[PDB]
Amino acid sequence: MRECISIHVGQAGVQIGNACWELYCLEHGIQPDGQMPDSFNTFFSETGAGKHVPRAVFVDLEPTVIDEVRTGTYRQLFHPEQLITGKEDAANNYARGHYTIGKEIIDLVLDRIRKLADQCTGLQGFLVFHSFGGGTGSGFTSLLMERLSVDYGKKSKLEFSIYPAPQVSTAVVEPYNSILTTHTTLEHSDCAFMVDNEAIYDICRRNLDIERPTYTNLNRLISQIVSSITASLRFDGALNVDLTEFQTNLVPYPRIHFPLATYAPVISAEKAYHEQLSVAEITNACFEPANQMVKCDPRHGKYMACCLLYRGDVVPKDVNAAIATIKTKRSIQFVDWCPTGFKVGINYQPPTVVPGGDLAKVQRAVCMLSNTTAIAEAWARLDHKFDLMYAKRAFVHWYVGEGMEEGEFSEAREDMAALEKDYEEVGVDS
Amino acid sequence: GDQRKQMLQKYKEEKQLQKLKEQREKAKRGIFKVGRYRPDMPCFLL
Numbered sequence A: 001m002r003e004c005i006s007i008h009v010g011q012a013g014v015q016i017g018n019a020c021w022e023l024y025c026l027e028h029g030i031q032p033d034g035q036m037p038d039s040f041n042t043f044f045s046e047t048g049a050g051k052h053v054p055r056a057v058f059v060d061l062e063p064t065v066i067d068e069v070r071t072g073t074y075r076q077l078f079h080p081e082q083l084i085t086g087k088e089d090a091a092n093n094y095a096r097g098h099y100t101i102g103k104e105i106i107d108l109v110l111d112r113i114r115k116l117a118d119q120c121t122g123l124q125g126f127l128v129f130h131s132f133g134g135g136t137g138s139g140f141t142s143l144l145m146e147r148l149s150v151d152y153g154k155k156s157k158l159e160f161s162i163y164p165a166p167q168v169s170t171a172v173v174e175p176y177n178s179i180l181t182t183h184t185t186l187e188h189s190d191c192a193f194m195v196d197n198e199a200i201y202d203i204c205r206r207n208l209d210i211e212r213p214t215y216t217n218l219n220r221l222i223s224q225i226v227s228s229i230t231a232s233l234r235f236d237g238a239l240n241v242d243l244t245e246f247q248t249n250l251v252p253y254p255r256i257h258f259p260l261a262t263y264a265p266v267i268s269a270e271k272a273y274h275e276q277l278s279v280a281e282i283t284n285a286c287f288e289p290a291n292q293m294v295k296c297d298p299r300h301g302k303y304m305a306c307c308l309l310y311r312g313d314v315v316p317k318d319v320n321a322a323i324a325t326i327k328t329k330r331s332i333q334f335v336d337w338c339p340t341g342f343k344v345g346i347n348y349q350p351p352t353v354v355p356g357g358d359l360a361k362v363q364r365a366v367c368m369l370s371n372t373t374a375i376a377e378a379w380a381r382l383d384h385k386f387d388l389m390y391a392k393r394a395f396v397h398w399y400v401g402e403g404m405e406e407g408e409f410s411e412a413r414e415d416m417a418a419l420e421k422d423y424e425e426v427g428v429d430s
Numbered sequence B: 001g002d003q004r005k006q007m008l009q010k011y012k013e014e015k016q017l018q019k020l021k022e023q024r025e026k027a028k029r030g031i032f033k034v035g036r037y038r039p040d041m042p043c044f045l046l
């Protein structure tokens, strides 16, 4: 049992999935062609004799990235009809991915997910990888999440995403897509993790001292985070973190389900020898504003619940010591209505190293997911960008052309402002 | 000689005034520039 289904929507999701599946194949020992020369049941199936098929699905409205997968070294891993492909890209348009182009591919992905979930007896949740800016990763992810909610229901729906950066962004119509997708993410996703590309670049520049990091390094870090998330399902440890109890401990209110991922230690090879990577120091480094994986300052916010996913050579004693030291620190501030705000999971499997990766071999690793109030700042700045572009009605006709109304933008903005008001209300003490 | 130095001071004042006017006109719209990033310093707990 303990099965999970991975969904990768858009280019960002497909490439992050390539990183994640290379990582899992390295972890469980499965060769790229699907043979091992137990614990893979969480992510891999069994087909006849010595075949491990990943429990994933690759959906994108343009063929380029999926055809990279179909021709790359992992072409034997997936069965051909698992990788789903449209004809025309959503073209950075929420409307195209949600109404016009996305409607001719949704039945096929839905029954593919149905058949993929029929093979597993202990399905726990879906991992949906997408981006908040692209037309596909916004619109089609919204459509898929609402169909999965009306179809599957009580199953958890974990969601990994690439939030647009405050400054360094690669799309012009990005805030529109982000607001439109969050208007449906607020209700159709049980726990949506936030990752920003700018923060990955900053982490790679400072810690991993890479002058020129590409998307493959970003996806490698994100894959490490997801592997740390699912290690409890895929391995054993002193304290196990199932997806359901993770969601229960991390989400205090139904609309507040946007925690911040962060991973530690992230270091270069040459920097690793001179560091005594103890549990206390990586636990401290998880709270460091420079090591945050989304460009927002936790100091301006107050934590509400943070889950600690230790893995490697970790004993609960020093975890308790580190948590106490954090509790004593005044810079890290917690809400008064959460006297205990740490969910702890210690695993036995150390984080593996992908060949050719930029991360050093480490005995211990921590993946913190803190549901802080600092994300209200990034959300409010995205709202400011949306308001600027919407006062002049710029780019709106590109959405009204194929299935949108002005009322959709107004509703999305009102819902997002309500979300900000909710975060402000839960921030203030009593 | 006093008249000559008074005229000298007046000339210097006029030159300074026109130079400042040109600087004010230039500063309204800077010229297009492009370089490297100069990343911001990371913030630390303090």
Ligand SMILES: Nc1nc2c(ncn2[C@@H]2O[C@H](COP(=O)(O)OP(=O)(O)OP(=O)(O)O)[C@@H](O)[C@H]2O)c(=O)[nH]1
Residues within 6 Å of the ligand: A009, A010, A011, A012, A013, A015, A016, A060, A089, A090, A091, A092, A093, A097, A131, A132, A133, A134, A135, A136, A137, A138, A162, A170, A171, A197, A215, A216, A218, A219
């Ligand atoms: N971290 C990371 N982000 C990516 C990667 N590839 C694309 N993105 C992000 O995706 C965002 C835009 O969406 P895309 O994935 O490019 O496009 P899409 O999701 O396929 O949707 P369309 O634009 O309609 O094609 C950009 O802001 C990128 O930050 C990647 O490999 N790694």
Ligand SMILES: [Mg+2]
Residues within 6 Å of the ligand: A010, A011, A062, A089, A134, A136
């Ligand atoms: Mg695309």
